[PDB]
Amino acid sequence: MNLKKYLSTAPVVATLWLFLTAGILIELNRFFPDSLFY
């Protein structure tokens, strides 16, 4: 019940989100490596 309220705090959301955008960049740089165009 209050566990999601812990998962709504500043650092936990910042790691579940920057982990996600970091995953967007790392998974988007294995699939499309050396992207200097566009």
18 forms part of the interface with ligand CLA (CB under 6 A)? no
**CA-CA distances (angstroms) from residue 18 to 13, 22, 38?**
8, 6, 24
**Rounded to the nearest whole angstrom, what is the least distance from the CB of residue 21 to other proteins in the complex?**
10
Query: Does residue 6 interact with ligand CLA by CB under 6 A?
Result: no
User: In whole angstroms, how close is the CB of 19 to ligand CLA at the nearest point?
Assistant: 6
20 is a contact residue toward ligand CLA (CB under 6 A):
yes
Could you say whether residue 31 binds other proteins (CB under 8 A)? no
Q: What is the 3-state secondary structure (H, E, C) of 1-38?
A: CCHHHHCCCHHHHHHHHHHHHHHHHHHHHHCCCCCCCC
